[PDB]
Write a protein that binds this ligand. Structure first.
Ligand SMILES: [Mg+2]
Length: 299
DNA sequence: CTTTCCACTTATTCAACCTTTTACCC
DNA sequence: GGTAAAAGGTTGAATAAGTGGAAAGG
């Protein structure tokens, strides 16, 4: 395997994608063999379905770090935990910063990086500090870690969209270009509606709200699934999609298989611009485009 | 002793999917 | 009087996270 077979991508796109996908990791493993009885591993990771391996390669090729591996049969991962390589990641994020609640996680990661850069994690005081940091990262401590270090453990990130490149990267993870086919009392009996969405956890409500000001269109939907809730930024007005959404991503290129879902959705947009969705022949072409996009896509 | 990477797991958070109802164009 | 836009859900697997094992040189 080669570090840069695939092309690199734009660092703001990389950052948008990183706001939408991936997590920092701080492992603190019980370890017989370590002087202190624990060892650590620090890093950053992204796990995607096999379909979107090209993206991991894009990133690897941009940073020149990271390992790409199988992640079970269905998925692949990029993990950076080589310690000195984390300087490349730090250097990337200082210059092209994250803006979702994940920024907070990057702050934990930096702090843990400091402790390790000084080698404090090799002694009991440094392990204690990493425990306090890990306590706030992702899912926090295992029950077993809490017994070992029962010490007492220590606010929402509020940031603006930096530019459209960030937005192309973020959409490449969390966006959806959908062709909705409404059973309708129209002539053909089916209405074609283009839907754009970006799906996000509730914590990033402010970001989602500010997408409305940013794109000059769309609205927020609160959705739920019994115990769990999430948000959608949604655009359904056709003239907004054609004059606002489409040009943005024509100028700022999506990455991964979603690029192909996007061009397929634009093909339908040209058809609707021409009123062709209102004839049988055009409805059928759309039905065929939809059939083979998104979950229906083979290549 | 410690770093690094490789194999592999699991559950809920997303993307993606649908129907029905209301807005509004004409 | 007919097409567009929004309301109002559902669906399932990809992503969010994680775990053990161990090669390799320090
Ligand atoms: Mg995500």
């Amino acid at each position: 395997a080669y570090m840069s077979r695939r092309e690199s991508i734009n660092p703001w796109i990389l950052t948008g994608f990183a706001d939408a996908e991936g997590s920092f990791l701080l492992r603190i493993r019980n370890n017989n063999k370590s002087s202190v009885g624990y060892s650590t591993e620090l890093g950053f990771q992204i796990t995607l379905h096999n379909k979107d391996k090209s993206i991991l390669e894009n990133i690897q090729s941009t940073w020149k770090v990271g390992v790409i591996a199988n992640s079970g049969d269905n998925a692949v991962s990029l993990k950076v935990t080589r310690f000195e390589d984390l300087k490349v990641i730090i250097d990337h994020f200082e210059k092209y910063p994250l803006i979702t609640q994940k920024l907070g996680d990057y702050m934990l990661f930096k702090q843990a990086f400091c402790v390790m850069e000084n080698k404090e994690h090799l002694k009991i005081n440094g392990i204690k500090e990493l425990v306090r940091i890990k306590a706030k990262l992702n899912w926090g401590l295992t029950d077993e870690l809490k017994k070992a270090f029962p010490e007492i453990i220590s606010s929402l990130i509020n940031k603006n969209i930096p530019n459209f490149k960030w937005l192309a990267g973020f959409t490449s993870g969390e966006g959806c270009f959908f062709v909705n086919l409404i059973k309708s009392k129209s002539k053909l009996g089916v209405q074609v509606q283009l839907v754009f969405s970006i799906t996000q956890h509730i914590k990033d409500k402010n970001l989602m709200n500010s997408l409305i000001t940013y794109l000059g269109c769309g609205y927020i939907k609160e959705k739920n699934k019994s115990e769990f809730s999430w948000l959608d930024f949604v655009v359904t007005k056709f003239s907004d999609i054609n004059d606002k959404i489409i040009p943005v991503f024509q100028e700022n290129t999506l990455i991964g298989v979603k690029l192909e879902d996007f061009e397929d959705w634009c093909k339908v947009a040209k058809l609707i611009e021409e009123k062709k969705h209102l004839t049988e022949s055009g409805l059928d072409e759309i039905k065929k485009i939809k059939l083979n996009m998104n979950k229906g896509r083979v290549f």
